[PDB]
Enzyme design. Structure first.
Site, short mmCIF file in Angstrom:
data_model
loop_
_atom_site.label_atom_id
_atom_site.label_comp_id
_atom_site.label_asym_id
_atom_site.label_seq_id
_atom_site.Cartn_x
_atom_site.Cartn_y
_atom_site.Cartn_z
N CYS A 104 0.85 -1.22 0.00
CA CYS A 104 0.00 0.00 0.00
C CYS A 104 0.88 1.25 0.00
CB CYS A 104 -0.99 -0.13 1.17
SG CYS A 104 -2.39 0.96 1.12
N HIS A 105 0.78 2.09 1.04
CA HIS A 105 1.75 3.16 1.29
C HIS A 105 3.08 2.72 1.88
CE1 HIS A 105 -1.82 5.79 0.76
NE2 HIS A 105 -0.95 6.79 0.57
#
Lengths: 171, 174
Positions: A104-105
């Site tokens: 994801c991030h």
């Protein structure tokens, strides 16, 4: 036995923590949450409460057989450390080719290692330009393995991510 | 006399409200540009803001300046599948139109691909990304690089507000 460090701050995406954590512990690998203060709680975006096991000041990267970096806004908080200690802790894993997992991030933290040039990664769309500017070959796949580095994009990718991270530790 | 403000959920409330009030006090209209016209976006601390213009219909030529409030709003904006906020912002960097960003706001400017050789500041958390984009990154309360005005944190707002108003007043020969 093998042990995975998980670096975490507030506002992590709950499932990015719990799902890989459960996949790893199911395969017999212990996990250990690294954050600002040992025995403090951090809280995910959707309310999940997680106790920090080891403070970043004390943490010895050489104790761990892998690093997991869950996404959400936790990686942004970690990069707020005035001494860059999370980037430094991560740099141990990238520099020594130890298995390193990010979803994801999460790949934001890897940018701070300066070790991405010529490496192939993916991440959530929001963060792909920054990965490219750090010198990664960025692609858009559910899971990407570059030697020791395993990245995925979103929670929908978790089955793929979880299979690859377990395979790393087995290897 | 219109300033575009690009805004998603989880903007830092004061980053929106304070520069907005400074601009409107100086005689400038502000227009909120977001995913859907008429919808509400909500700040980290609850502030509710109504979107005036949908990003699909937005025309950057309509505006005298672009304001980008921080918090996690810019990260949300960078999640647009067609990259339309980056594209909107590119009009301002390409044409040297006044462009104001505070805190995380400068993240959006990375998407213009127009940062190389420009001088900026931002919140610590995003400085490395600005550096990788080719910017000269400094640690100052406000930085003015021709058309681009940046600041770091809410404590900088007095300086930021002074500079963005000055930019606009000079554009209109006040």
């Amino acid at each position: 036995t093998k042990k995975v460090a998980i670096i975490l701050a507030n506002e992590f995406e709950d499932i990015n923590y719990s799902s890989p954590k459960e996949a790893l512990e199911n395969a017999g690998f212990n996990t250990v949450v690294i954050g600002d203060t040992a025995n403090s709680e951090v809280v995910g975006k959707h309310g999940e409460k997680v106790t920090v096991d080891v403070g970043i000041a004390e943490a010895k990267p050489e104790d761990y057989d892998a690093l997991l970096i869950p996404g959400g806004f936790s990686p942004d908080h970690l990069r707020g450390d005035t001494e860059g200690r999370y980037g430094t802790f991560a740099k141990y894993f990238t520099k020594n080719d130890v298995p390193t997992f990010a979803i994801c991030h999460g790949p934001q933290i890897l940018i701070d290692t300066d070790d991405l040039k010529g490496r192939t990664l993916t991440a959530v769309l929001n963060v792909r330009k920054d990965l490219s500017n750090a010198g990664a070959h960025v692609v858009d796949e559910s899971v990407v393995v570059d030697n020791n580095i395993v990245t995925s994009r979103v929670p929908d990718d978790l089955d793929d991510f979880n299979r690859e991270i377990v395979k790393q530790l087995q290897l």
